[PDB]
Design an enzyme around this catalytic site. Structure first.
Site, PDB file in Angstrom:
ATOM      1  CG  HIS A   1      25.683  17.044 -22.387  1.00 34.10           C
ATOM      2  ND1 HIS A   1      26.370  16.874 -23.558  1.00 34.10           N
ATOM      3  CD2 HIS A   1      24.467  16.464 -22.592  1.00 34.10           C
ATOM      4  CE1 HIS A   1      25.614  16.213 -24.423  1.00 34.10           C
ATOM      5  NE2 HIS A   1      24.438  15.963 -23.871  1.00 34.10           N
TER       6      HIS A   1
ATOM      7  CG  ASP B   1      20.006  -1.271 -20.468  1.00 37.93           C
ATOM      8  OD1 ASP B   1      20.429  -0.171 -20.883  1.00 37.93           O
ATOM      9  OD2 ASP B   1      18.993  -1.396 -19.729  1.00 37.93           O
TER      10      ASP B   1
ATOM     11  CG  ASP C   1      20.298  15.750 -33.795  1.00 38.52           C
ATOM     12  OD1 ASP C   1      20.154  16.351 -32.698  1.00 38.52           O
ATOM     13  OD2 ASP C   1      20.829  14.637 -33.893  1.00 38.52           O
TER      14      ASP C   1
ATOM     15  CG  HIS D   1      23.016  11.882 -22.001  1.00 43.25           C
ATOM     16  ND1 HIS D   1      23.283  11.156 -23.139  1.00 43.25           N
ATOM     17  CD2 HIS D   1      22.794  13.152 -22.425  1.00 43.25           C
ATOM     18  CE1 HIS D   1      23.242  11.960 -24.194  1.00 43.25           C
ATOM     19  NE2 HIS D   1      22.938  13.183 -23.794  1.00 43.25           N
ATOM     20  CD  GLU D   2      20.531  15.412 -20.229  1.00 45.73           C
ATOM     21  OE1 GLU D   2      21.189  16.352 -20.740  1.00 45.73           O
ATOM     22  OE2 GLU D   2      19.887  14.575 -20.910  1.00 45.73           O
TER      23      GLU D   2
ATOM     24  CG  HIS E   1      20.896  13.779 -30.104  1.00 43.29           C
ATOM     25  ND1 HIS E   1      20.772  15.120 -30.385  1.00 43.29           N
ATOM     26  CD2 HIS E   1      21.004  13.692 -28.758  1.00 43.29           C
ATOM     27  CE1 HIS E   1      20.821  15.818 -29.261  1.00 43.29           C
ATOM     28  NE2 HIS E   1      20.966  14.970 -28.262  1.00 43.29           N
TER      29      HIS E   1
ATOM     30  CD  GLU F   1      24.002  14.010 -27.387  1.00 39.65           C
ATOM     31  OE1 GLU F   1      23.467  12.914 -27.092  1.00 39.65           O
ATOM     32  OE2 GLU F   1      23.934  15.032 -26.657  1.00 39.65           O
TER      33      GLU F   1
ATOM     34  CE1 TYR G   1      25.286  18.095 -27.874  1.00 38.08           C
ATOM     35  CE2 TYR G   1      23.538  19.481 -28.708  1.00 38.08           C
ATOM     36  CZ  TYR G   1      23.951  18.323 -28.102  1.00 38.08           C
ATOM     37  OH  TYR G   1      22.988  17.409 -27.708  1.00 38.08           O
TER      38      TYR G   1
ATOM     39  CG  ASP H   1       8.659  17.394   1.841  1.00 37.73           C
ATOM     40  OD1 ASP H   1       7.794  17.102   0.978  1.00 37.73           O
ATOM     41  OD2 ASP H   1       8.688  16.836   2.948  1.00 37.73           O
TER      42      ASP H   1
END
Ligand SMILES: CC(C)C[C@H](NC(=O)[C@H](CC(C)C)NP(=O)(O)CNC(=O)OCc1ccccc1)C(N)=O
Ligand SMILES: [Ca+2]
Ligand SMILES: [Ca+2]
Ligand SMILES: [Ca+2]
Ligand SMILES: [Ca+2]
Ligand SMILES: [Zn+2]
Length: 316
Positions: free
Chosen positions: A146, A185, A226, A142-143, A231, A166, A157, A57
């Protein structure tokens, strides 16, 4: 890149202003040198080649619409780093301050985010199911979680180990959301899911069944979609974790809540000392019981509540 540490300012996906740690060398780059061996954010430019280009930038101001997913990926990676370091004494995802890399603007209309074995990756969403997914602090955490899992327990997985994988990501995603303390939450992804619908989310930990996910082992999925329901069956573990923290009576079984901090301590210890790549739900219960025993004593309320919560979700 080699350069000097700077502080930029910009706006995230939800329109909020925040400061970001940058590096100056001709351009201002999304490279935060203040945390470990750095946090680096990249532009994938709507393509699928990774990582793309380190985000550059001209003026250290990040208020353009195109900038917003990068601002949040970068900033929320910093919050997540801070949570693991300050709360669990863990230095980055590998425990040795590995550089944390994220790419934004991945693909076109991409309604997902993932850890690819080496970095985090965020779609922009299609504007209807999702807005850019790095706008959710629970999503970012969350990511990154992992990566933590892959460096520690290594939960495969698929099937039950994958549903534990998960749930660990949803649990710590939520605990990071509470740590930052902005509209926290026990829902997953609410900040970036379905901009035209208020009050919904991708999953609920407090009531998984709201979105069709099981809240008891007797309702587990055993088909092949899945990755064997990773999940989906995560709802059983998410519910157990919610009950450990918050308490409740579920299918007639009462759980005395012990709060979020103790939940996080128990599950962090289970993840890093007891779980293995092939752990199943019963083995997770045993790991959590042992972890609570180590931390609080065999006769403690914390151990009793872990047992209650797994009983409530049908996991022995
Ligand atoms: C729904 N997604 C998720 O709930 C989260 C995102 C939420 C929190 C907004 N993504 P996630 O769980 O990280 C995706 N996993 C993934 O790609 O594994 C495969 C993979 C990729 C790359 C390498 C190995 C394996 C879903 N069904 O994918
Ligand atoms: Ca600029
Ligand atoms: Ca929230
Ligand atoms: Ca949330
Ligand atoms: Ca929504
Ligand atoms: Zn996940």
């Amino acid at each position: 890149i080699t350069g000097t540490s700077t502080v930029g300012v910009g706006r995230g996906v939800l329109g909020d202003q925040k400061n970001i740690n940058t590096t100056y060398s001709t351009y201002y780059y999304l490279q935060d040198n203040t945390r470990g061996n750095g946090i680096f954010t990249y532009d994938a430019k709507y393509r699928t080649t990774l990582p793309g280009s380190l985000w550059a930038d001209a003026d250290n101001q990040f208020f353009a619409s195109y900038d917003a997913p990068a601002v949040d990926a970068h900033y929320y990676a910093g919050v997540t780093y801070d949570y693991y370091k300050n709360v669990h004494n863990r230095l980055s995802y590998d425990g040795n301050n590995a550089a944390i890399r994220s790419s934004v603007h991945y693909s076109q209309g991409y309604n997902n985010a993932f850890w690819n074995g080496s970095q985090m990756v965020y779609g922009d969403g299609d504007g209807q199911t999702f807005i850019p997914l790095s706008g959710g602090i629970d999503v970012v955490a969350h990511e990154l979680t992992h990566a933590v899992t892959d460096y520690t327990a290594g939960l495969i997985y698929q099937n039950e180990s994958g549903a534990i994988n998960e749930a660990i990501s949803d649990i710590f995603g939520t605990l990071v959301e509470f740590y930052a303390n902005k509209n926290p939450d026990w829902e997953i992804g609410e900040d970036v899911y379905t901009p035209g619908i208020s009050g919904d989310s991708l999953r609920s930990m407090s009531d998984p069944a709201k979105y069709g996910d099981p809240d008891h082992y007797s309702k587990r999925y055993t088909g092949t979609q899945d990755n064997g329901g990773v999940h989906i069956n995560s709802g059983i573990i998410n519910k157990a974790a919610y009950l450990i923290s918050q308490g409740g009576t579920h299918y007639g079984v009462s759980v005395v809540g012990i709060g979020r901090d103790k939940l996080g301590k128990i599950f962090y210890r289970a993840l890093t000392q007891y779980l293995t790549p092939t752990s199943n739900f019963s083995q997770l219960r045993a790991a959590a019981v042992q972890s609570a025993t180590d931390l609080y004593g065999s006769t403690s309320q914390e151990v009793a509540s872990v047992k209650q919560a797994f009983d409530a979700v049908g996991v022995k």
